[PDB]
RNA sequence: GGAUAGUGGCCUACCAUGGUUUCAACGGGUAACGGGGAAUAAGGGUUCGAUUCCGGAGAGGGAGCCUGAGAAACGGCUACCACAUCCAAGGAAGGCAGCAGGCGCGCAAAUUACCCAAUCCUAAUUCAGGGAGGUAGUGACAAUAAAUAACGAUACAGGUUGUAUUGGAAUGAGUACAAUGUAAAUACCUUAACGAGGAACAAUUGGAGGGCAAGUCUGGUGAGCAGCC
């Protein structure tokens, strides 16, 4: 038979369910950034967990070990590109100081709010899912899309929508027609 | 010290000693002897199906007082005879003799549950319909 | 709006008397472009007969506006007719669909014939006499 | 009731065009269950009467199965006799299976 | 010495009395095919591997053998053992642990569908053949992304935030002309027309003494609840 397709699980569940102090901290993030699930938080903390595991491992290696040089530089370079880590803090020891809010701040859903365009993080989510936002030429409709530092110049309304320059939507057209027809009465 | 050999070539004695002492662990002994195949009503399966022989009431152990409702069942694969609890009170109206039922463990890994002396299994389905669906009036039992 | 056609990664392939390339199409404000229209515009730009042009395998970008596919142009109508798969020629109407029986029926006929030795003009006569 | 009381198999006919009436049609099903039934089969015979595309037939068939399963949760299939494969399947069951 | 493609107690004649073991031989058990591997992340370990790749074995059970470079072959043959089919009662024929399907079993598992277009293999061969293989159907095993509403006005209260009458905008679920897709089709991606105000286009499953988030509420009662207390 054909070779197996590989797949993997992307989140982890907190090991004590009813730790009351934790429940409060999670709900503030969801209200601040307009998330729909706790899973959206678990996903981020799962990624952050693995980054620390790798970084902490490398720090056992001596400086000028060729592996620490090669892979350590890759990891730092890759986080700077998305803007999670400042290019001032461009050193491996600072990777251990990142926290969840550093990643949520970079989601397309929040960037479309900080730029204007929308007027709440709840309004921003609606526009993305309804296909009004484009990055460069490509229409994007996923809220969790991580905006790389180059792309921020190119976020704007899509060419093929109202707000972007196309024809009015289905409901505006219906209203104009009935009123025009009645105005002929 | 510590009453166990430490020497660098002593490996044979250490491992042999460990084997002899694992037989005191209770669940370990069950696997190696294969006890769940040779005995216990389910042959190591999580469920079994059986036929209802008669209807019973079982009074609670102290301090409580209540005649709790149970049935005798005979398992189809083993022919062994067992007593099972029926949840949700008035659901006892849905079970009658020569019904076929699906049984599950009563949650305590072969021990009886709570007040009830010697009752280890609970009914899950009757005649192919679930008791929970009957209790909530979601389905209907065809007679036989 | 005007359609724009572009070709990329152009290879000349003397071993099969053809040119082969990527076809890239921009088409704002319409759903897509038909293969039949692409075949015409490619024919006049490469100065070929329309029957020597073959085009397949398109998909259109998410959010629309662009499509990408693959294209061939043969050095003659005769050479196209020998190297091209028959199913593509049917799409272009350069060949006629053959009318064989269903796959299960053909197999069952074969197994009946295996039971006859020789041509079977005899035996038929013997059965007629019975 | 007297006829169905003696059967090994009861074949329930359903219509794709008109749904069963609560004042009569359902009372048949309800009464037969409470006297007891040796076995039961769900059948459709006229689903092509609402053809536009057979996906529209599938939409109806799913509704009938969900309805039928309410009374007979042991069964999850209703056959369409307009299709040779289903009708042969039904015939085989009556011949081969025990009640 | 014989036999084998060939070494060798592999077998035969004659001769000697040896070989293994508490560093566990021999015997018994395995709900035991071996390995690459899988789950569980402080470290050391514990449990599992019938199953996509590599190697072994078998074609109901034992034995024998023809053809051939290669078989102790089972979609080859012969006999016995156990099953079992047709008949004019003289005889003849058999092997799904290939694909699809049926009975039985049980807690426990899909269509008697389309095709050689792709991957490759075989033949005297570019061309024929391939249930190997691919396509679609069934499919809450497991996995990825992610709808069920957003924003103004008015009235009221608060310091730009809550609580109720009212107005334009936005969109896919769904349906459908067309093109694209494909061996031919279905679906996805794209798109003319249609498609929301209780936006009935209506989200469930378990809990509220403690472990362990959340009721001195309110009506009934004096069989029920509870893994544990």
From Swiss-Prot, chain A:
Ubl conjugation recorded as keyword: yes
Annotated SMART domains: Ribosomal_S4, S4
Modified residues (Phosphoserine): 183
GO cellular component, one term: nucleolus
Cell location: Cytoplasm; Nucleus, Nucleolus
Gene3D superfamilies per UniProt: RNA-binding S4 domain (3.10.290.10)
PANTHER family according to UniProt: 30S 40S RIBOSOMAL PROTEIN, 40S RIBOSOMAL PROTEIN S9
Subunit organization: Component of the small ribosomal subunit (SSU). Mature yeast ribosomes consist of a small (40S) and a large (60S) subunit. The 40S small subunit contains 1 molecule of ribosomal RNA (18S rRNA) and 33 different proteins (encoded by 57 genes). The large 60S subunit contains 3 rRNA molecules (25S, 5.8S and 5S rRNA) and 46 different proteins (encoded by 81 genes). Interacts with snoRNA U3. uS11 interacts with MPP10. Component of the ribosomal small subunit (SSU) processome composed of at least 40 protein subunits and snoRNA U3.
Function: Component of the ribosome, a large ribonucleoprotein complex responsible for the synthesis of proteins in the cell. The small ribosomal subunit (SSU) binds messenger RNAs (mRNAs) and translates the encoded message by selecting cognate aminoacyl-transfer RNA (tRNA) molecules. The large subunit (LSU) contains the ribosomal catalytic site termed the peptidyl transferase center (PTC), which catalyzes the formation of peptide bonds, thereby polymerizing the amino acids delivered by tRNAs into a polypeptide chain.
Name assigned to this protein: Small ribosomal subunit protein uS4A
Swiss-Prot record, chain B:
Key word Translocase present: no
Other facts noted in the record for this chain: Present with 10600 molecules/cell in log phase SD medium.
InterPro entries associated with the record: NA-bd_OB-fold, Ribosomal_uS12, Ribosomal_uS12_euk/arc
A molecular function (GO) term: structural constituent of ribosome
GO terms of biological process kind: maintenance of translational fidelity; maturation of SSU-rRNA from tricistronic rRNA transcript (SSU-rRNA, 5.8S rRNA, LSU-rRNA); regulation of translational fidelity; translation
Protein purpose: Component of the ribosome, a large ribonucleoprotein complex responsible for the synthesis of proteins in the cell. The small ribosomal subunit (SSU) binds messenger RNAs (mRNAs) and translates the encoded message by selecting cognate aminoacyl-transfer RNA (tRNA) molecules. The large subunit (LSU) contains the ribosomal catalytic site termed the peptidyl transferase center (PTC), which catalyzes the formation of peptide bonds, thereby polymerizing the amino acids delivered by tRNAs into a polypeptide chain.
UniProt subcellular location: Cytoplasm
Family according to the record: Belongs to the universal ribosomal protein uS12 family.
Modified residues (3,4-dihydroxyproline): 63
UniProt keyword terms in alphabetical order: Cytoplasm, Hydroxylation, Isopeptide bond, Ribonucleoprotein, Ribosomal protein, Ubl conjugation
Cross-link entry Glycyl lysine isopeptide (Lys-Gly) (interchain with G-Cter in ubiquitin), positions: 55
PTM note: Hydroxylation at Pro-63 affects translation termination efficiency. The stereochemistry of the 3,4-dihydroxyproline has not yet been determined.
PANTHER family (UniProt xref): 30S RIBOSOMAL PROTEIN S12 FAMILY MEMBER
Protein name listed in UniProt: Small ribosomal subunit protein uS12A
Major place of residence: cytoplasm
One Pfam family recorded for the sequence: Ribosom_S12_S23
Swiss-Prot record, chain C:
Keyword terms: Acetylation, Cytoplasm, Isopeptide bond, Phosphoprotein, Ribonucleoprotein, Ribosomal protein, Ubl conjugation
Positions carrying Phosphoserine: 12, 54
Gene Ontology BP term (one): maturation of SSU-rRNA from tricistronic rRNA transcript (SSU-rRNA, 5.8S rRNA, LSU-rRNA)
Superkingdom of the source species: Eukaryota
Predominant cellular place of this UniProt entry's protein: cytoplasm
Region feature Disordered, mapped onto this chain: 100-130
Subcellular location: Cytoplasm
Biased composition (Basic residues): 103-113, 122-130
A GO cellular-component term linked to this record: cytosolic small ribosomal subunit
Post-translational modification: N-terminally acetylated by acetyltransferase NatA. Also partially acetylated by NatC.
Cytoplasm recorded as keyword: yes
PROSITE patterns recorded: RIBOSOMAL_S24E
Cross-link (Glycyl lysine isopeptide (Lys-Gly) (interchain with G-Cter in ubiquitin)): 19
GO molecular function, one term: structural constituent of ribosome
HAMAP family: Ribosomal_eS24
Family in the record: Belongs to the eukaryotic ribosomal protein eS24 family.
Note in the entry: There are 2 genes for eS24 in yeast.
Record's function text: Component of the ribosome, a large ribonucleoprotein complex responsible for the synthesis of proteins in the cell. The small ribosomal subunit (SSU) binds messenger RNAs (mRNAs) and translates the encoded message by selecting cognate aminoacyl-transfer RNA (tRNA) molecules. The large subunit (LSU) contains the ribosomal catalytic site termed the peptidyl transferase center (PTC), which catalyzes the formation of peptide bonds, thereby polymerizing the amino acids delivered by tRNAs into a polypeptide chain.
PANTHER family reported for this sequence: 40S RIBOSOMAL PROTEIN S24
Protein name: Small ribosomal subunit protein eS24A
Gene this chain is encoded by: RPS24A
From Swiss-Prot, chain D:
Compartments where located: Cytoplasm; Nucleus, Nucleolus
Its biological purpose: Required for 40S ribosomal subunit synthesis. Required for normal export of the pre-40S particles from the nucleus to the cytoplasm. Its subcellular location and association with pre-40S subunitshifts from mixed cytoplasm/nucleus to all nuclear in RPS19 disruptions, suggesting it acts after the ribosomal protein.
Any further remark recorded for this protein: Present with 1390 molecules/cell in log phase SD medium.
Assembly, per entry: Interacts with RIO2.
Record-stated family: Belongs to the TRAFAC class translation factor GTPase superfamily. Bms1-like GTPase family. TSR1 subfamily.
Annotated protein name in UniProt: Ribosome biogenesis protein TSR1
Organism: Saccharomyces cerevisiae (strain ATCC 204508 / S288c)
Lineage, broadest ranks: Eukaryota, Fungi, Dikarya, Ascomycota, Saccharomycotina
This protein's encoding gene: TSR1
